[PDB]
Amino acid sequence: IALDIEKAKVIQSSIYTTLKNVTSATEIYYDPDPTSTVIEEDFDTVEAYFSIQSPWLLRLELDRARMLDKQLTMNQVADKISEVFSDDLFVMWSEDNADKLIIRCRVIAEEDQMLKRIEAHMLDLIALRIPGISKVYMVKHKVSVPDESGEYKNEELWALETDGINLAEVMAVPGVDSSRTYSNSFVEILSVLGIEATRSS
Amino acid sequence: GLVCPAETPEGQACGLVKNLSLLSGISIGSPSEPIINFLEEWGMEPLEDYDPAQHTKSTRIFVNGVWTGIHRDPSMLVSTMRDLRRSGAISPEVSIIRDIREREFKIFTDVGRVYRPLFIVEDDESKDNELRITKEHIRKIVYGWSSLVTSGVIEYVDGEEEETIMIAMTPEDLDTAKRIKPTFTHCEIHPSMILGVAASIIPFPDHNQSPRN
Amino acid sequence: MEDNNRIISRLWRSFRTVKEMAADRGYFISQEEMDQSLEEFRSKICDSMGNPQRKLMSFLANPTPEALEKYSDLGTLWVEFCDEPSVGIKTMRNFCLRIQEKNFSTGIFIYQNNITPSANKMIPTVSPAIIETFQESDLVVNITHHELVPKHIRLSDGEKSQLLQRYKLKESQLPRIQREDPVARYLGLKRGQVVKIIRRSETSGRYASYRICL
Amino acid sequence: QESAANIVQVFKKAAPSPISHVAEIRSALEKGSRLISTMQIKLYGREDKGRTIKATLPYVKQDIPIVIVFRALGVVPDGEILQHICYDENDWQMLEMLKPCIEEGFVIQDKEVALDFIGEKRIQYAKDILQKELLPHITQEEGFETRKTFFLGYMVNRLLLCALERKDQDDRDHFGKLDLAGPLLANLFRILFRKLTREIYRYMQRCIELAVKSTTITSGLKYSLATGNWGE
Amino acid sequence: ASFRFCLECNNMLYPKEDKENQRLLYSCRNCDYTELAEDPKVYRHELTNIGETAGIVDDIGQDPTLPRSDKECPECHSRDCVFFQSQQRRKDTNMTLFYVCLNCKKTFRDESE
Amino acid sequence: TMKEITHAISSAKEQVQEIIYKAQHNELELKPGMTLRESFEGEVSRTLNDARDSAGRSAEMNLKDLNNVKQMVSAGSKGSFINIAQMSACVGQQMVEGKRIAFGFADRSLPHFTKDDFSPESKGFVENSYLRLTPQEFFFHAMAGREGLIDTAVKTAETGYIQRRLVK
Ligand SMILES: [Zn+2]
Ligand SMILES: [Zn+2]
């Protein structure tokens, strides 16, 4: 896969998206009845989630356009969330069809203090799809190369350039050539590929 | 206007040493009270007793960096002080800036504010659309510069007050040879005044690579 | 398929790498034994549903017909893997002992996430033999394979005691290489061993450098 | 000799720092001694961690959480404090921010304790640093506590006005924000006449029952003007 | 949110739960005052668009440093308007023009999406 | 030719007024990785530059094999295209820190300008030739050169340090 346009993207988005980057707002309401809400645009989302806790609520309103960019799914998003805390935090969510994406949840001695520390632990210590690797652009480069017929010829190939640096990890990713990867951070290169390769850099 | 763009030492300290334009002058140090008073007696309800909600969009006023109360409708407080300076009853050296876009009133007596002089425009023409100064004042030049100011025909604009005015270049205007040329409150005495002693002797400084000048 | 389909694809590349290192170290191994496709691999070290059981991957290998020619006493190596994603000081004695008796000389445990501080503090406790530790997530891609990584090579205490005479060197005057150097580990060096590096050069074609391991 | 004084500035402080944003104001009496001590109205808690507001005062070792600075000033109840900072009860965001801060000072409930936590002997000194050191311009008189309070309020405001992306970080090089000859002699003369002042104090402190060496103001002036070294 | 204080000793309001009856209370920790919940909403984070209209006193037609466009508001149909861009100092904002009319004080844009 | 150029700046001026109208309407999409605003500049810049580029090129081919300045350029003994350009055609766009003359004055270049003027006559584009700058143009230009002079008076000895090190 060289001039595989879509293959480029397919790797881009596989190299750090956090809950914090898809959440338009978060609120913590008081709903003591675990079988209906004090909220309108939520009703449906309860009843349609009982077939095939603490009275303190925490709602998140995720962005639509933001779920198409980094591409995400309520099923996934939550799936992640749920398995992050696990058996001591029941969570629910609407379905991608709706006109308002949401995620409700409760815990399981002063709860308004706890359900707020778990406000952050949700927006800054939880990843969805690595680290230190922000912006990641794509480019069409000039790569001279051996035609079968001998002569060297123009065969541009897509390449992903980053805006941060981690190697040991972004190296073992399915779809790259851990024989050509390269960070200008020589410091790193030496640590990963052996002083020699370091010198080369 | 205040400093010459060209004259300044090469290497070492470069830009840490500035020279004054021809027209620039520095403030000296007037007194505050004859204006603090002159105020809290023309609409300035003192800070001491303030109420944020009864007085919503209350334009707050500052004096030399102190907050001496707010004022209700200021539009006039403004075009009164400005009429006071032009007759010469609040030193032409003081600075008064009205920042509508924030609702505040700047008062400066300070000593060390560089200022330049400009012609006043004022749409004061019940005969058209104009520089308060006329070709009668000119040819009239017992008529010093002290009078050109005591008649509200020219004003001393410091850098701060500058922010809220609109200056016209060529008084007049505002051939396949000359250089192509592209609300006013003041006009420029003359653009060739933004220069200081140094460049003033340079012929056609407007034709050389700036770094050479 | 979920996201466990990949935790296999990797354990496999990490594998082949081990092999390569073992043959490059100076042992026997067929190019095929390295080229075991992902397919014909699954059904060989898996149980029921589709999970790989490592306790059955570990193996041995030995000094090639050649290796015995430059390096006499180069003993036999043993590579081991473990299903305990956090192996500790206890499941350790099973390794520390397994060789101190079979009498090999080269231990190679592949800890998945991490070994215990109580554990590894029992490595240099069985000489002459020596033991190494390699994290899993660090052997997924053979580092030697990299573009910038030039070919290195060991040197008998003969080929070494030669370089020195041939260049009139006092050992210290020779370019060095770190013990914890990625490549140094890969070929399993030791404090006192030399390494000839041979890389391409836009000036002569090939230059021959040497690094002793401090 | 050419940054102007007595003005409010707000600066963002790099990702690596316990402080988020901070607002400062360099103050000095336009006429009279002229102290060079600045006010720091910080804002701890980076743009994440669960965000207090503390400020620095002249001569105080550590920093104080704005709430106390208010009660220690003359404003003891909450919401009367938020009174000064925020000017629009319908601006929940800002107010929210303040919340955590109020909790900080919730432990000191009056002017007694207010001026205390600032370490009978200690309480008295507390006052001092507020009438002669705290935002010393405005005036160092006495019965104006109120005024300084509205400032420290206008300040804590300016801070947030930015930490909420409504106003940019202050433009450090906005020329609008020159001590000629005349002024120079001033700050210089004082330094002199003042040594003459406390000189004339010694002749008066020996007479167990003329003296004014008018050479310190003559020779002092000369030295400077001669070389180029102002300070004595 | 728009939270509340309290009569008596004007202070901050902390919430507590009506255990036995299941409902929300607000209170004070200086005295004793206590009031029921105004709304089930307690806290919001919100990760803007408010502040583009930035203080526009009628006098905004006296700030000479502002541009002049000869359009015509969507109501009074005049031809003396002044404008600018959002005052929201955000490097990522957009560039649409907001207009004020010397004959009303409206807020019509140039936008079209 | 002095005319043919003038109108290569006028038209270039409108290809700017045009993309400014089309921006003051939100009628343009954000080129991935860039801000809606930044992407506005990115074009204005690429517009004036290409304008200026041929502005000069018209004169370049307009100077016969007798023009002395040309001669001194072909011989390779002094100056280049750029030079002729800035002397017979258009001086160019002025700049500091990489962006056309800032807004030191709240929302404007000089007090002689209407707020929010993002045009080129405000951001520092000297449309004039040395043979023929307007105050504004003349100023920006200075602010631009000023940045230049700066490092030629800084990189001068820090470069020398870095040198010294390599040596020792
Ligand atoms: Zn109360
Ligand atoms: Zn209207």
Give a summary of the structure in a few sentences.
Chain C is an alpha/beta fold and 214 residues long. Helices cover 29% and strands 18% of the residues of chain C.
The computed structural class of chain A is alpha+beta
* Largest sheet data of chain A: 2 strands, antiparallel
By CATH, the architecture of the domain at 7-129 in chain A is named: 2-Layer Sandwich
Give every kind of bound small molecule, once each.
zinc ion
Across the major sheet of chain A, the strand order is: 1-2
**Name of the top-level CATH class of the largest domain in chain E:** Mainly Beta
Structurally, the number of domains of chain E stands at 2
Specify the overall morphology of chain E.
Answer: elongated
Strand content of chain A: 15-25%
Tell me what the structure shows.
The structure is cut from a larger assembly and holds 2 copies of chain A, 2 copies of chain B, 1 copy of chain C (214 residues) and 1 copy of chain E (113 residues). Chain A is of the alpha+beta class and 201 residues long. Chain A has helices at residues 5-12, 44-47, 65-69, 74-85, 111-123, 186-200; strands spanning 23-29, 59-62, 90-91, 105-106, 137-141, 144-146, 152-154, 157-161. In chain A, 28% of the residues lie in helices and 15% in strands. The longest helix of chain A is centred in the last third of the chain and has 15 residues, at 186-200. Helix content of chain B is 15%, strand content 19%. Chain B has helices at 33-36, 75-87, 135-138, 145-150, 159-162; strands spanning 25-26, 44-45, 59-63, 66-71, 95-98, 104-108, 114-120, 154-158, 167-168, 186-188. In chain B, the strands form 2 sheets. In chain B, strands 1, 7, 8, 9 and 10 form a 5-stranded mixed sheet that branches. Chain B is globular and about 60 Å long. Chain C is 29% helix and 18% strand. Chain C has 7 helices and 7 strands; from the N terminus they run αααβαβαββαβαββ. A 4-stranded mixed sheet of chain C has the order 1-2-3-4, with helices on one face. A 3-stranded mixed sheet of chain C has the order 5-7-6, with no helix packed on it. In chain C, α5 (90-102) links the parallel β2 and β3 (105-110). The longest helix of chain C is centred in the N-terminal third of the chain and has 21 residues, at 6-26. Chain E is mainly beta. Chain E has a 3-stranded antiparallel sheet, with no helix packed on it. Chain E has a 3-stranded antiparallel sheet with strand order 5-6-7, with no helix packed on it. Chains in contact: A-C, A-D, A-E, B-D, B-E, B-F, D-E, E-F. The B-F interface holds B 5-6, 10-12, 14-15, 162-163, 165-169, 176-183, 188, 191, 194, 206-211 and F 2-3, 6, 9, 86, 105-106, 110-112, 114, 121, 127-128, 130-136, 138-139, 141-142, 145-146, 148-150, 153, 156. β1 of chain A pairs antiparallel with β4 (41-44) of chain E. The structure holds zinc ion (2 copies). One zinc ion binds next to loops of chain E. One zinc ion binds at residues 73, 75-76, 78, 101, 103-104, 106 of chain E.
